[PDB]
Scaffold this motif. Structure first.
Motif, PDB file in Angstrom:
ATOM      1  N   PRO A   1      15.657  30.706  -2.604  1.00  0.00           N
ATOM      2  CA  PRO A   1      16.813  31.207  -3.353  1.00  0.00           C
ATOM      3  C   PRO A   1      16.609  31.070  -4.868  1.00  0.00           C
ATOM      4  O   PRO A   1      15.882  30.193  -5.347  1.00  0.00           O
ATOM      5  CB  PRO A   1      17.972  30.328  -2.863  1.00  0.00           C
ATOM      6  CG  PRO A   1      17.325  29.136  -2.246  1.00  0.00           C
ATOM      7  CD  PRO A   1      16.002  29.584  -1.719  1.00  0.00           C
ATOM      8  N   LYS A   2      17.232  31.969  -5.615  1.00  0.00           N
ATOM      9  CA  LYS A   2      17.148  31.958  -7.066  1.00  0.00           C
ATOM     10  C   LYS A   2      18.570  31.845  -7.598  1.00  0.00           C
ATOM     11  O   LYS A   2      19.376  32.737  -7.353  1.00  0.00           O
ATOM     12  CB  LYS A   2      16.448  33.228  -7.565  1.00  0.00           C
ATOM     13  CG  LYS A   2      16.293  33.356  -9.075  1.00  0.00           C
ATOM     14  CD  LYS A   2      15.680  34.711  -9.419  1.00  0.00           C
ATOM     15  CE  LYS A   2      15.596  34.952 -10.918  1.00  0.00           C
ATOM     16  NZ  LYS A   2      15.144  36.352 -11.172  1.00  0.00           N
ATOM     17  N   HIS A   3      18.875  30.747  -8.295  1.00  0.00           N
ATOM     18  CA  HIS A   3      20.249  30.439  -8.727  1.00  0.00           C
ATOM     19  C   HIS A   3      20.554  30.854 -10.168  1.00  0.00           C
ATOM     20  O   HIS A   3      19.742  30.641 -11.058  1.00  0.00           O
ATOM     21  CB  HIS A   3      20.537  28.934  -8.616  1.00  0.00           C
ATOM     22  CG  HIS A   3      20.421  28.382  -7.237  1.00  0.00           C
ATOM     23  ND1 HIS A   3      20.847  29.064  -6.116  1.00  0.00           N
ATOM     24  CD2 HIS A   3      19.947  27.192  -6.785  1.00  0.00           C
ATOM     25  CE1 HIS A   3      20.646  28.326  -5.045  1.00  0.00           C
ATOM     26  NE2 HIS A   3      20.094  27.180  -5.427  1.00  0.00           N
ATOM     27  N   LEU A   4      21.744  31.394 -10.398  1.00  0.00           N
ATOM     28  CA  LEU A   4      22.192  31.713 -11.752  1.00  0.00           C
ATOM     29  C   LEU A   4      22.857  30.507 -12.431  1.00  0.00           C
ATOM     30  O   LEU A   4      23.876  30.018 -11.971  1.00  0.00           O
ATOM     31  CB  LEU A   4      23.175  32.886 -11.712  1.00  0.00           C
ATOM     32  CG  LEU A   4      23.146  33.958 -12.806  1.00  0.00           C
ATOM     33  CD1 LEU A   4      24.338  34.895 -12.631  1.00  0.00           C
ATOM     34  CD2 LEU A   4      23.135  33.349 -14.188  1.00  0.00           C
ATOM     35  N   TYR A   5      22.295  30.036 -13.536  1.00  0.00           N
ATOM     36  CA  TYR A   5      22.909  28.934 -14.259  1.00  0.00           C
ATOM     37  C   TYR A   5      23.609  29.380 -15.529  1.00  0.00           C
ATOM     38  O   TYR A   5      23.048  30.113 -16.355  1.00  0.00           O
ATOM     39  CB  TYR A   5      21.878  27.877 -14.621  1.00  0.00           C
ATOM     40  CG  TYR A   5      21.357  27.112 -13.441  1.00  0.00           C
ATOM     41  CD1 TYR A   5      22.062  26.032 -12.930  1.00  0.00           C
ATOM     42  CD2 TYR A   5      20.150  27.468 -12.834  1.00  0.00           C
ATOM     43  CE1 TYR A   5      21.595  25.320 -11.855  1.00  0.00           C
ATOM     44  CE2 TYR A   5      19.670  26.758 -11.748  1.00  0.00           C
ATOM     45  CZ  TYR A   5      20.405  25.684 -11.261  1.00  0.00           C
ATOM     46  OH  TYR A   5      19.943  24.968 -10.185  1.00  0.00           O
ATOM     47  N   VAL A   6      24.842  28.913 -15.666  1.00  0.00           N
ATOM     48  CA  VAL A   6      25.607  29.010 -16.892  1.00  0.00           C
ATOM     49  C   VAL A   6      25.895  27.580 -17.357  1.00  0.00           C
ATOM     50  O   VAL A   6      26.229  26.718 -16.549  1.00  0.00           O
ATOM     51  CB  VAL A   6      26.908  29.812 -16.676  1.00  0.00           C
ATOM     52  CG1 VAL A   6      27.843  29.662 -17.855  1.00  0.00           C
ATOM     53  CG2 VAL A   6      26.586  31.277 -16.422  1.00  0.00           C
ATOM     54  N   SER A   7      25.717  27.313 -18.646  1.00  0.00           N
ATOM     55  CA  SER A   7      25.901  25.963 -19.163  1.00  0.00           C
ATOM     56  C   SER A   7      27.375  25.574 -19.240  1.00  0.00           C
ATOM     57  O   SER A   7      28.252  26.429 -19.363  1.00  0.00           O
ATOM     58  CB  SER A   7      25.263  25.827 -20.544  1.00  0.00           C
ATOM     59  OG  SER A   7      23.848  25.761 -20.451  1.00  0.00           O
ATOM     60  N   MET A   8      27.642  24.276 -19.155  1.00  0.00           N
ATOM     61  CA  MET A   8      28.961  23.751 -19.473  1.00  0.00           C
ATOM     62  C   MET A   8      29.153  23.824 -20.991  1.00  0.00           C
ATOM     63  O   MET A   8      28.235  23.491 -21.745  1.00  0.00           O
ATOM     64  CB  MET A   8      29.110  22.320 -18.959  1.00  0.00           C
ATOM     65  CG  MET A   8      29.116  22.216 -17.439  1.00  0.00           C
ATOM     66  SD  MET A   8      30.765  22.381 -16.701  1.00  0.00           S
ATOM     67  CE  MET A   8      31.507  20.812 -17.154  1.00  0.00           C
TER      68      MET A   8
END
Length: 281
Positions: free
Chosen positions: A59-66
């Motif tokens: 799987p390839k996850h989308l990260y958005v920062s806090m």
């Protein structure tokens, strides 16, 4: 501020469903997914987003920062919403993703027959083009002609980072546009971006469209305020400045908004837009 080129390149590498998944979450359920999130980044997943490496799917996850609190590369939810509502407005429309923030000024009904509206508007006579007299130059005195003049004008205010972004996006799964009279131009604002999306900045009259919506927000705020229980101040103290916000932030991207276009939007469309405000109950 934000490096829209770098951020967009990252986002453009993902499958459309996971991008829209995160765009849905951060637009509608914005402040709560941040409150609920264990730690350093917000992780997004979806079965459409993977990497074949090689006999096995990873799987390839989308990260958005806090977003606490204080540079250029980082993808905060605000930067993500701004970028993605510009990159994929056709998909946003197809999934009918509308931020409540826009839902309450009746965005859904407003765009319902968008092409008919924007074409009617552009075929109308422009009060800032003098003057038809001879009714055969009539094509030269329309709002459409004003927008052609404007388009050539903003072309002079382009920044390379956003030029680069646009060019990269066109070769990818973005659904960009070059003209306002397209079914999807208005949908870049469906998720309530806090400024004109980067990729839309140089389409004539589109950043002014965002401004139009922002003014409607203030208008709704004014209307809601008059009939609410209000320390007589705390009524004035928690007022809104949506337009000043959108204005400051969009013009910080190296463009000046055409106030005259903003005025033509508001006076053409304002009356009927107000009739579709959610007030409130």
């Amino acid at each position: 501020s934000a490096d829209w080129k770098a951020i967009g390149a990252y986002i453009l590498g993902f499958a459309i469903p996971i991008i829209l998944k995160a765009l849905y979450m951060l637009s509608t359920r914005g402040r709560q997914t941040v409150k609920d999130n264990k730690g350093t980044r917000i992780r997004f997943k979806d079965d459409s987003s993977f990497e074949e490496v090689n006999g096995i799917r990873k799987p390839k996850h989308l990260y958005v920062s806090m977003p606490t609190a204080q540079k250029a590369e980082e993808i905060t939810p605000g930067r993500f919403r701004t970028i993605a509502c510009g990159l994929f407005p056709a998909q946003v429309k197809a999934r009918n993703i509308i931020s409540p923030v826009m839902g309450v000024i009746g965005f859904g009904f407003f765009v319902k027959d968008w092409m008919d509206r924007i074409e009617e508007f552009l075929a109308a006579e422009c009060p800032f083009l003098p003057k038809p007299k001879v009714a055969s130059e009539a094509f030269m005195s329309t709002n459409k002609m004003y927008f052609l003049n404007r388009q050539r004008q903003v072309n002079e205010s382009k920044v390379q980072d956003i030029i680069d972004l646009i060019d990269h996006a066109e070769t990818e799964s973005a659904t960009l546009f070059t003209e306002i009279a397209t079914p999807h131009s208005v949908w870049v604002f469906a998720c309530a971006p806090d400024r004109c999306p980067p990729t839309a900045l140089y389409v004539a009259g589109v950043p002014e469209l965002g401004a139009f919506f922002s003014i409607l927000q203030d208008m709704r705020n004014t209307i809601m305020a008059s009939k609410s229980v209000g320390t007589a101040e705390e009524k004035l103290k928690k007022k809104s400045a949506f337009y000043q916000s959108y204005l400051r932030r969009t013009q910080s991207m190296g463009i000046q908004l055409d106030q005259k276009i903003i005025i033509l939007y508001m006076l053409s469309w304002g009356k009927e837009a107000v009739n579709h405000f959610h007030l409130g109950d």
